[PDB]
Amino acid sequence: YKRYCIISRFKNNIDEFISQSLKIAIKELQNSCSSSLIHDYIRKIDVLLTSIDSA
Known about the structure:
This protein is mainly alpha-helical. Helices cover 67% and strands 0% of the residues. It is classed as transport protein.
């Protein structure tokens, strides 16, 4: 229900903590409707993850 936005926000705070990244690749991929229904700050929140992944 409303937990699809919470767990995405829970994975957003957990991906900022940095194999283990391969399980993180499952959280970052397979977009069916979560990368279509969601807000305007979540787009730059995805940019903060890959730049942190660039380190």
